[PDB]
Ligand SMILES: CC(C)C[C@H](N)C(=O)O
Ligand SMILES: [Cl-]
Ligand SMILES: [Cl-]
Ligand code: NA
């Protein structure tokens with residue numbers, strides 16, 4: 430688990446497989462960002478003609494008898510006056526991939542000189558650490574013979590004092606243990622990550638942390654609470670649903686309580702409104718909202734933030750079969766709101782609705798933040814690298830946007846358009862579960878908002894349908910499950926709730 434170390438002296442550093450040298454780009458030419466031993470400079474002179482120091486650019490070369498490390502990566506950081514946290518995070522993520530592909534296990538990273546820049550050492554180190562940790566991850570693999578890329582085992586940052594660097598490193602490492610859990614849960618087979626498995630994961634977290642308690646509802650208990658929207662989605666499933674409540678009481682004397690809700694559809698066939706095969710292929714990802722809540726709670730308990738947080742995960746497959754809930758029928762949530770089914774493939778908002786009602790009935794929330802791979806319309810709206818979110822509270826939205834900016838997990842607020850609430854109109858129910866216009870992400874958000882039933886709680890909804898899972902690898906995330914949102918929300922809670 431411990432990966433990153435600080436080392437003050439360049440001269441007293443230990444041998445490592447690789448050395449990462451930082452460069453700026455100055456007038457389209459590579460420019461050393463730190464003081465480099467002139468013997469090392471001669472070694473990579475050959476490589477400078479095709480390396481200009483553009484951000485994330487790398488050049489790989491071998492050392493010689495005059496260098497300690499026998500592999501050398503030149504890493505571009507871009508223009509020095511334009512250096513940013515996302516630039517640093519993405520550059521060291523890129524270097525991590527290069528190092529691992531070169532089969533390196535130990536790395537020395539020379540820290541640049543940034544004293545002349547308004548960019549702080551703390552911010553640089555935080556993003557260096559996050560970029561390395563993000564791409565030092567392996568998604569699960571099942572090959573008959575293990576084929577996975579080797580991990581980096583030790584990464585030493587040269588030129589910083591242990592006091593400043595190590596506190597940052599250990600914090601990011603504990604946070605990324607939660608990120609990795611999220612990624613593992615999303616990546617793993619849907620036949621393995623069932624609703625029961627999600628409950629077992631939550632029970633294991635509660636077992637591990639004295640600060641965490643858990644409550645698990647099976648199908649019978651879901652029906653006893655009258656959560657008929659979750660029960661309807663689960664009706665046809667061949668595995669039993671679960672409703673999972675995690676409680677972290679880090680500030681028992683405060684009434685301030687954050688409720689996190691994660692959509693846990695462990696496989697989404699679409700139901701009777703069956704998805705086309707090519708649309709169904711990745712649908713083990715449809716529980717990424719739930720996995721995000723679990724990963725946040727892992728980091729929350731490890732970091733021991735002094736705040737109160739409750740996690741709520743409705744979990745079920747959305748199956749097709751003889752007992753599947755019906756197109757055109759009306760189902761009723763636990764407070765009596767009725768929902769006419771326009772599409773069984775709009776099932777996530779149903780189970781979130783009962784979870785929201787549950788939160789308001791039992792958890793006295795100050796704010797509710799939900800996470801869901803909710804709509805295809807969101808991927809059309811904002812693509813795979815920016816997640817849209819909705820919020821009924823401008824402070825909450827501004828805070829989440831600031832946390833997004835500072836962690837590099839890109840969010841973009843979208844509007845809760847009042848004119849589109851009528852798009853959910855039903856003649857026979859409080860609402861339909863799909864809107865009559867084309868703005869599917871907005872009407873899905875407006876649907877969730879109904880379940881606040883005019884309670885004044887602050888609420889934000891993150892539609893991670895695009896960012897949760899990448900079929901094409903894109904910085905700063907691995908291929909497939911990204912873990913998007915875990916880092917952003919831990920930073921939000923630490924910065925805006927815990928002080
Ligand atoms: C026009 C499209 C929505 C058609 C789709 N196959 C459906 O009937 O649900
Ligand atoms: Cl169809
Ligand atoms: Cl708030
Ligand atoms: Na680990």
Ligand code: NA
Nearest residue numbers: 635638639641
């Ligand atoms: Na516990």
Ligand code: NA
Nearest residue numbers: 702703704774
């Ligand atoms: Na359809």
Ligand code: NA
Nearest residue numbers: 895896898899
């Ligand atoms: Na995606």
Ligand SMILES: [Zn+2]
Nearest residue numbers: 697774775776
């Ligand atoms: Zn669906």
Ligand SMILES: [Zn+2]
Nearest residue numbers: 694697715777
């Ligand atoms: Zn779904």
